Amino acid sequence: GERDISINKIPTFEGGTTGWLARPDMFSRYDFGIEIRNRRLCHQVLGFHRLEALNDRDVTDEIPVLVNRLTLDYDLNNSVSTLVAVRQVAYETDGSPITQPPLEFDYQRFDTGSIPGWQEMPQLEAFNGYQPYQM
């Protein structure tokens, strides 16, 4: 998310100084006996060609062209994030984007607005309550 995620901006090989974001749902691992903070998730991936060097023609300031831009979109929640979609993009020399069809996803969202009411347990109805239970 450093370079402008806008479809109407082709990114650049240099990223400026906006700085890479940290995910909403940050945490750590521990399992190797150490702190293991987990923070960065990617949203754009970029193919760069050093055109005039590829031409063997020129090398001064051959800042590579962004050939194509994979673009990646996530659902974000306080405890998780994961892809809503991806899409392939390329760019006209006037900088107009051209697009492939996107590709969507929807993993099972935990929700508790869902949650329904109670029911009794005729199958069990007395077999607990301190000592009356074992399992």
Place this chain on the structure above:
Amino acid sequence: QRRIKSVSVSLPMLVGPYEDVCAQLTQTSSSYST
């Protein structure tokens, strides 16, 4: 020799935490005695 000391008895049924367990018992006779 052989003779009775005492005895107890029970039922498994989970009547409820304190519900009405209720019954009566007696020997009609220990026909042999003494």
